[PDB]
Amino acid sequence: APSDLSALIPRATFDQMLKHRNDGACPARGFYTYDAFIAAARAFPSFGNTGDTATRKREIAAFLGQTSHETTGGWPSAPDGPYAWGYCFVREQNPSAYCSPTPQFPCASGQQYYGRGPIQISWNYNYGQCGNAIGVDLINNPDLVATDPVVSFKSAIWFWMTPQSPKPSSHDVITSQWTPSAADVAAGKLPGYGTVTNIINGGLECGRGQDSRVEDRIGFFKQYCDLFGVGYGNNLDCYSQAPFG
């Protein structure tokens, strides 16, 4: 029913979800704008536009939930709780090179590929693939992900939308466009938020029982689903899944 992404998630709804990102304690304050989120989403037109209204909202809640975790400034006694403190930072706290050079994706001398933006995109080969897809030279200018908020949001929606075999895209998983193979079922990878967590960081966070990072991902997702007035779906954790390679 909402005709486009702006109607699906109005400015006031986005700002309620990301309620503390512009607080004085957040190093990225003033950076992540609603306008940049809407403008960036144009590069991936099926994002938030796949499925019925509930599914579209669940996708946006899941995207905001995962990226909120990646950039959270929350703590247990934070005002409005830890799931109101997404999007608090934009650069990984401590820098590292994150360089693994190949002929396809070199490392530009002098550049560092530490986490930046909503999905904390890292490594020259990820910046390289992302930049090729969105039309920006992120090998030579990776810090554009932290200085231009439309490039920042494009990098995170690129990640969300892009399959990387053997992984499906997070998009396809959360919008019921992906069905598990028999092997995927044996690996516990069923459609839902947990399989998205596995796609994002399962090699560290999944298959090891309850994990505080995963609990934080889920809490943000539930908070945003609650605001949208939609249910969470099933299979929310990845606690006994096999990690994707």
* Elucidated via: X-ray
Q: Kindly state whether residues 63 and 139 are assigned to the same domain.
A: no
CA neighbor of 71 nearest in space, from 25, 38, 26: 26
Give the C-alpha distances (Å, rounded to integers) separating 218 from 8, 16, 134, 192, 211: 21, 18, 29, 11, 11
Cα-based torsion angle of the residue sequence 68, 195, 191, 74 in order, rounded to the nearest 10 degrees? -20
Strand partners, 132: none
**Resolution to 1 decimal place, in Å:** 1.5
Q: Kindly state whether residues 116 and 206 are assigned to the same domain.
A: no
Amino acid at residue number 231: G
What is the rounded radius of gyration, in angstroms, for the C-alpha atoms of the chain?
17
Q: Exposed/middle/buried for 1, CB within 10 Å: 0-12, 13-18, 19+?
A: exposed
Q: Return the structure tokens found at 34.
A: 């609603």
Q: Return the structure tokens found at 241.
A: 């899944």
Q: Kindly state whether residues 26 and 142 are assigned to the same domain.
A: no
Q: Return the structure tokens found at 215.
A: 């609990």
Q: Kindly state whether residues 140 and 119 are assigned to the same domain.
A: yes
Q: Which one of 112, 129, 147 terminates a domain?
A: 147
Q: Which of left, alpha, beta for 51 (phi over 0: left; psi -120 to 50: alpha)?
A: left
Q: Contact, 45 vs 4, CB < 8 A?
A: no
Peptide bond connecting 95 to the previous residue in cis, omega within 30 degrees of 0? no
Q: Kindly state whether residues 7 and 108 are assigned to the same domain.
A: no
Q: Kindly state whether residues 136 and 177 are assigned to the same domain.
A: no
CA dist., res. 99 & res. 109, Å (int): 10
Q: Kindly state whether residues 141 and 48 are assigned to the same domain.
A: no
CA dist., res. 185 & res. 25, Å (int): 43
Q: Kindly state whether residues 242 and 171 are assigned to the same domain.
A: yes
Q: Kindly state whether residues 83 and 96 are assigned to the same domain.
A: no
The string of DSSP codes covering the chain is ---SHHHHS-HHHHHHHTTTTTSTT-TTTTTS-HHHHHHHHTTSTTTT-SSSHHHHHHHHHHHHHHHHHHT----TT-TT-GGG--S--SB-SS--------SSS---TT-----BTTTTB-SHHHHHHHHHHHT--TTT-TTHHHH-HHHHHHHHHHHHH--BTTBPPHHHHHTT-----HHHHHTT--SSHHHHHHHHHHHHHSSSS--HHHHHHHHHHHHHHHHHT----S----TTSPPP-
Amino acid at residue number 144: L
* Active centre residues (catalytic): 70
| CATH number (domain holding residue 138) | 3.30.20.10
- Widest pairwise Cα distance in the chain: 50
Q: Which one of 99, 120, 147 terminates a domain?
A: 147
CA dist., res. 32 & res. 18, Å (int): 10
Q: Return the structure tokens found at 38.
A: 């809407």
Neighbouring CB atoms inside 10 A of 139's CB total 18
Q: Return the structure tokens found at 209.
A: 């029982």
Cβ within 8 Å of residue 92, ≥6 positions away: 114, 115, 116, 120, 122
Residues in the chain, total: 245
CA neighbor of 130 nearest in space, from 115, 142, 118, 112: 142
Sign (positive or negative) of CA dihedral 234, 59, 12, 219? positive
Q: Exposed/middle/buried for 89, CB within 10 Å: 0-12, 13-18, 19+?
A: buried
| CATH number (domain holding residue 165) | 1.10.530.10
**Whose structure tokens read 């536009």?**
49
Can you give the residue range of the structural domain that contains 153?
Answer: 1-90+148-245
The domain tally of the chain equals 2
Q: Kindly state whether residues 182 and 158 are assigned to the same domain.
A: yes
Q: Kindly state whether residues 63 and 49 are assigned to the same domain.
A: yes
